[PDB]
Amino acid sequence: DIVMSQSPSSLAVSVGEKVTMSCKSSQSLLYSNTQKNYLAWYQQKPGQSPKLLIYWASTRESGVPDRFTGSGSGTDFTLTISSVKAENLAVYYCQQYYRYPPTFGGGTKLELKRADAAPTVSIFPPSSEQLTSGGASVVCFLNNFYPKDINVKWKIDGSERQNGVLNSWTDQDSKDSTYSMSSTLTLTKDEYERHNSYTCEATHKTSTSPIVKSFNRNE
Amino acid sequence: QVQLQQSGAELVKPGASVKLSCKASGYTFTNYYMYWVLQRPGQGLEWIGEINPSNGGTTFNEKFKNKATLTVDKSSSTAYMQLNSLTSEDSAVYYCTRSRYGNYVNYGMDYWGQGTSVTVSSASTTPPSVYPLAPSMVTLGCLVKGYFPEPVTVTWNSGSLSSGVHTFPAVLQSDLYTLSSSVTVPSSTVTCNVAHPASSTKVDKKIVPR
Amino acid sequence: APDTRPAPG
Numbered sequence: 001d002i003v004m005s006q007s008p009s010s011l012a013v014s015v016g017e018k019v020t021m022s023c024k025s026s027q028s029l030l031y032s033n034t035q036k037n038y039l040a041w042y043q044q045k046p047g048q049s050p051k052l053l054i055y056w057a058s059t060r061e062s063g064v065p066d067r068f069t070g071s072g073s074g075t076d077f078t079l080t081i082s083s084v085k086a087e088n089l090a091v092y093y094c095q096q097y098y099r100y101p102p103t104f105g106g107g108t109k110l111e112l113k114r115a116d117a118a119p120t121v122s123i124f125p126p127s128s129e130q131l132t133s134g135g136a137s138v139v140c141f142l143n144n145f146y147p148k149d150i151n152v153k154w155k156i157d158g159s160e161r162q163n164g165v166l167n168s169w170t171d172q173d174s175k176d177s178t179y180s181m182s183s184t185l186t187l188t189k190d191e192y193e194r195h196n197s198y199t200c201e202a203t204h205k206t207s208t209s210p211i212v213k214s215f216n217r218n219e
Numbered sequence: 220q221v222q223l224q225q226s227g228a229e230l231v232k233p234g235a236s237v238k239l240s241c242k243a244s245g246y247t248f249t250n251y252y253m254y255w256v257l258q259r260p261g262q263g264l265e266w267i268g269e270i271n272p273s274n275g276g277t278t279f280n281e282k283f284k285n286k287a288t289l290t291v292d293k294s295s296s297t298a299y300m301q302l303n304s305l306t307s308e309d310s311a312v313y314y315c316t317r318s319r320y321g322n323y324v325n326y327g328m329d330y331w332g333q334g335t336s337v338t339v340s341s342a343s344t345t346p347p348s349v350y351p352l353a354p355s356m357v358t359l360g361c362l363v364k365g366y367f368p369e370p371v372t373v374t375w376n377s378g379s380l381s382s383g384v385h386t387f388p389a390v391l392q393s394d395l396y397t398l399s400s401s402v403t404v405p406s407s408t409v410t411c412n413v414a415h416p417a418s419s420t421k422v423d424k425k426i427v428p429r
Numbered sequence: 430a431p432d433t434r435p436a437p438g
Contacts, residue, residue: 049332052329168387
């Protein structure tokens with residue numbers, strides 16, 4: 001198969017910026033002396049089907065504004081949005097039709113740039129309702145941080161714990177352009193009741209030291 | 220005018236088959252190759268195969284040789300894709316799509332169906348357990364655990380509280396789904412409202428500080 | 430050279 005590589009996978013932009021995203025191909029998509037390059041660009045917004053923007057590397061599908069510009073030749077292609085609008089925030093895929101199977105790139109997601117924001121971090125004991133099921137979930141919310149890169153680390157009585165941890169990340173918020181994350185440490189009820197201190201440590205670019213939130217089961 | 224109408228969502232057990240449909244209108248069906256494309260949850264796009272609706276000839280991706288069968292009914296302008304020996308790896312949204320033809324290739328998939336969600340698990344319909352998460356501005360939450368299938372809806376005070384809500388994507392834990400919702404409010408009751416339509420479930424948990 | 434197809438119809 002031809003492999004289509006898009007860089008970067010994620011790109012933060014401002015309304016009004018010029019934006020270039022890149023697409024590289026493992027074989028030449030240029031046929032001979034025809035000056036035709038067998039490459040297309042698609043847009044996908046969340047919960048919608050993909051929309052064709054560009055084909056033959058540089059020709060725009062009808063009804064696509066000229067704010068979108070395809071170019072390149074052979075193996076190296078780019079898509080440019082000359083003046084980004086909010087309605088342009090999406091994933092963009094490239095796709096070759098030089099050879100079967102047709103193959104897509106991995107996509108480049110366009111997000112909105114904003115000022116850095118530290119996570120608000122909250123930790124929650126298991127409810128007594130839940131302890132009754134003989135499982136025990138400790139939840140930790142990390143809310144309204146920017147940028148989206150973050151790590152959560154769990155500690156039980158001081159000792160890191162990696163098993164039974166489940167994380168869930170929101171897409172960029174439409175109100176404030178932040179991200180949020182939920183982390184859940186899942187234990188048996190027996191194990192939960194054998195330990196006293198539960199800690200949730202967040203590492204984010206806004207803080208030189210981790211953000212630590214804990215509770216003691218007896219308190 | 221041009222329209223691809225795909226069939227309803229699908230929920231099936233491992234080893235089953237589905238036959239998805241894709242009714243085409245607004246153009247001469249037989250004059251465009253029909254492509255099928257899948258998108259696994261939170262992932263990219265992958266081509267499955269093509270059918271030439273005028274003679275019914277097909278080509279598949281190596282990866283879907285035995286997985287998929289493509290056909291058409293010309294008299295109803297419908298393309299069909301059947302999937303066999305279904306694993307949970309095959310849970311995804313499946314698109315049918317019209318390609319434009321020119322210079323001897325299909326150069327652009329210009330109209331897409333809305334997609335068809337196929338979900339493959341051996342789980343059965345299960346209502347969620349709903350647990351409270353109790354602690355100037357304060358945050359509370361609501362853990363929604365062990366339910367099948369998607370989705371659930373979470374609201375806070377019956378819609379009253381719309382500010383400061385994060386409902387997180389569901390996550391798979393023992394073939395059943397779990398999600399969390401948080402809500403932030405000032406200092407002085409809050410109630411989370413979970414609906415699981417599949418199990419005719421509505422449940423209101425009061426969040427009791429401390 | 431591209432993988433080619435005949436026109437549908």
